[PDB]
Design a protein around this ligand. Sequence first.
Ligand SMILES: [Mg+2]
Ligand SMILES: [Mg+2]
Ligand SMILES: [Mg+2]
Ligand SMILES: [Mg+2]
Ligand SMILES: [Mg+2]
Ligand SMILES: [Mg+2]
Ligand SMILES: [Mg+2]
Ligand SMILES: [Mg+2]
Ligand SMILES: [Mg+2]
Lengths: 131, 441, 118
Amino acid sequence: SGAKFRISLGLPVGAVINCADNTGAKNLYIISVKGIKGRLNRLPAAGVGDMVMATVKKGKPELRKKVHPAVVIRQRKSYRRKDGVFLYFEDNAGVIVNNKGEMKGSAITGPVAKECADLWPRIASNAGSIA
Amino acid sequence: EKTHINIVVIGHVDSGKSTTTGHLIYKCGGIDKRTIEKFEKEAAEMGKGSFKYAWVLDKLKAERERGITIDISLWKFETSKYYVTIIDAPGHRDFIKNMITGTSQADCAVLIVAAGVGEFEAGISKNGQTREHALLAYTLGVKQLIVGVNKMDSTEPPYSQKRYEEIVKEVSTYIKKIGYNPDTVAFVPISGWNGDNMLEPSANMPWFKGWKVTRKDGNASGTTLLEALDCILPPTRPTDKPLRLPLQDVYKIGGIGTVPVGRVETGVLKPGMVVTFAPVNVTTEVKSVEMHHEALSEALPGDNVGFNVKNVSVKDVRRGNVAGDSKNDPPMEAAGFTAQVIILNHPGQISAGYAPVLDCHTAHIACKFAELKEKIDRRSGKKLEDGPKFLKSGDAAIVDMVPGKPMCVESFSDYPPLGRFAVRDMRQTVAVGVIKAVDKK
Amino acid sequence: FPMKQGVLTHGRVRLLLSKGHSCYRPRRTGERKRKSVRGCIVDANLSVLNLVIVKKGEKDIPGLTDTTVPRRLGPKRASRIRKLFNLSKEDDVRQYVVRKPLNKEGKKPRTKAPKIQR
RNA sequence: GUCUCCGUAGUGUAGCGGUUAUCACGUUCGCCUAACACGCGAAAGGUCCUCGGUUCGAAACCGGGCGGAAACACCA
RNA sequence: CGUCGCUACUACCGAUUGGAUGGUUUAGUGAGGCCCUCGGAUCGGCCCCGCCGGGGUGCCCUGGCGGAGCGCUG
RNA sequence: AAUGAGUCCACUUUAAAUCCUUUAACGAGGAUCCAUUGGAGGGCAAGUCUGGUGCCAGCAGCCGCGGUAAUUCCAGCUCCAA
RNA sequence: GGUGACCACGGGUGACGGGGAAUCAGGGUUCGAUUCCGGAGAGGGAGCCUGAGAAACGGCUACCACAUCCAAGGAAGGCAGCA
RNA sequence: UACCUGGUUGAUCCUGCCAGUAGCAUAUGCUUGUCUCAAAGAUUAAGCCAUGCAUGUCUAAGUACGCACGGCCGGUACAGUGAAACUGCGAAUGGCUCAUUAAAUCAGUUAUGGUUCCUUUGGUCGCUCGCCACUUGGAUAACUGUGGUAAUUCUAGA
Ligand SMILES: [Mg+2]
Ligand SMILES: [Mg+2]
Ligand SMILES: [Mg+2]
Ligand SMILES: [Mg+2]
Ligand SMILES: [Mg+2]
Ligand SMILES: [Mg+2]
Ligand SMILES: [Mg+2]
Ligand SMILES: [Mg+2]
Ligand SMILES: [Mg+2]
């Protein structure tokens, strides 16, 4: 199998990231991160490959005032990939999925982090490229 | 060259139907190595690695996600003696109508039986389907079948002689009651996932000498499942009778329109000849005929053929219709038909009026008893009583039927594969019947 | 993808190839089509490498430097046979042409000579 | 195909594994008026979509199948 | 004849710095082609000319290896 | 007595056919080898016929018909127009 | 400076223009996507090679939207032609 | 064919609209025996297209050493029939559609003394004083051979 290693998160609650799928949503506003137990005063933060709860602030009106599961596919914060490579992306981007992991949309614009691609097979199939 | 037959693989859930079928296909020149390598890549990506051979036929997203065979799928592989296309049954009581559909359009049947400890016994039980699949194959009209014993490496100890002999005995003791002769039925110990005893004789199990069959037409004795597939007797194809096509599925392909696909029961189908569909009563002209990505000029009986009819939408003709020649006598709606049902397993008493689902050929539509005419003995059409009040399991009876939803049926005397039907209720097999008379509109 | 002289890189590039450049023949007159070509610098990532011997070694390579296959058909121009056979001026130019002897089983044997030009 | 929900007098549709009931009507309906209308009186009216299992017995506990009502997939 | 009360249908106003789909555009970024100024991966000619050679008679008519004149050139 | 509409040989046509025109032989007495579509209060040609329904069902472009004796609805018959 | 109540400019068109069609006292009112002539376009734009003639698309280049094959490294598209 | 009729009222003259009436042009319903013509995915989506075809071309008169056939008449450059290929020409016509387009397109009229023009036809082609001309040089096709890619009407080396 193989589990995901720890990476630098850099996307706390309240971050607005780009919406990289063709669902008609333009951005995702992260309201929480899945699997976060917590700590007093600590903001729950997410890296690439993390499932988050998000609301779209701008986009199609039938997606706006709801809570969607999303997965972070690109982050601007540099992270180490266990081989000495510190990688970061041009923008923070995620895609809208359901709780089972498959995307609401059908295509992804831009690259997808290898961590997210390895952890979510349904995202990796629609990924144009893996960085 | 080559003759056409159809084979259905029937058995219990998790007994290895789709995996066995896919590996038999791969060994018989079905698909190249890199396509199945990509299939295994995907299978590893989600998790279900052992289901990779199951993917060759289970192409749908839902089937691939659940790892469960839902719908019938076709695939072709050329063998030593002749061409064959395989019907992959679901193997679930939830999709029993689907396998009734699939078993109807098949000439032979491969009864896959699990050999691992526990799975065999769970298969042969009141909630099992190894009884049900074999019974319905005999009901719908599959005479010659083969029983294959799978998962020889799963059982403890692996490749055991005592296990296989016990399986053969326990299958034979009930297949005699169903109707198939174990002397004519070939028994093959196989392993689809490992690929054992399928194309070449085995090395892990030298104890198996070889199966033998004793038929009137010809005696055969092979070592692998392929040799058993070749020795299957050719069916009697009724080419002179008027054409009938029980419809399997409807597709709307880009640029060639809506192409009904169904098995040729009687007659011959050719391009440029006007057909009528019995239930919806729509006339249309056939453009072209093909099979398995290959065209045909003449479509012989017992062939899964796809033909393009002109100017009919995908919704107008749906799953379950019967197609036929417009010039020859057509299939027409059956307002009522007198059927000879034999009650197999029904706990409650049968009165005239309860509505089970009656599956004639491909489709499934519930029907209601109007009145029960005569209580008839278990064979020979021997009259016993006039006008019974109620019926019970273990008896035959002539009955007149009024379907709730419109349906077309044909008599067993005119078209023998049309006449076969089964009756289902209580989520079980309640009766077995054939149609002798039918009233048209 | 064949390599093109002058690309001056290792890897593949896309070039708008016109008539008579390389790696491209025009389907119709004036047509230029963009095509992918390998760079001229050779590295590990190749299928084949074309090599042409410029000068002979000390010994003979088996199957390569032996059994010299002749050029099929000789010169067709009158001046081009004059150079090859050192003709001065009009010295049996008709009969100094190269005659091609062709032999087939059912064929009745015959010699073949070209229509010499200029 | 795959899932998600809804489906009880003719509609309004409460419901409780020991009872599908009532309500507003709609109708019927004595009840007036030539006829109305206006009032007066009463009634009927339910397989709980449907069929099963569970259960001492279930509409409902569980599952199916059918329709609708939403998606999601679906390329010889 | 009008208000009021009940039931339908049709439009109107209306917070929501409402929403959606078109069209035309400012500004920013800007593929690609074309033109100009460079550029020079390569391919040919002359100067070949270390030499054997040479004929009107060391003074070559050149039939080739070969360096390369390490220039002039297209 | 006369004919076709159809069966159908040949010719003809035509790139090759088809069709038309010719032409053998069959082919009409419910000549069952069967003419329909809309109407009959007025506008607007045609019934104050008969049987049902009873302000219901329905008809009705408009006037209007129908609440138990309907020239108007549903039908039969008979008529009208093309 | 130039154009405008002699209607500029702007907007709409369910507008390709014309020869023509329907109707028919006379006058008119509507219709002309449609076989003849002229124009425009080849999914939307844009830029070009060749050639006397093209801003050609049953030619090319790029972007956008769709969309085919793939061994995922690439490659190939334009039926408002006849079906 | 230069035409009217029913409906406001207790009844009458009007105004006035509604309804009737006839044609054609789309669809639809019912019906349909013969024969001659004949429109036909324009209206909505100038929306999307599988497959197949729709543009190729040689005379005596540009280039044949393909055997791919073949007359040889036999001591000869080339008999001839000709694949392929080079060269030349065509592929800017035709066909489809009507989205754009409101002095724009288009119609009639007129001009290019303000321009270009393949092809055909007709002129012009000794008008020029200036060590191959009895004919000059090199390359490349087709062709042989070695291949690369999963793939293409992709192409490289010799
Ligand atoms: Mg705090
Ligand atoms: Mg010459
Ligand atoms: Mg009448
Ligand atoms: Mg327009
Ligand atoms: Mg026009
Ligand atoms: Mg035109
Ligand atoms: Mg154009
Ligand atoms: Mg263009
Ligand atoms: Mg030219």
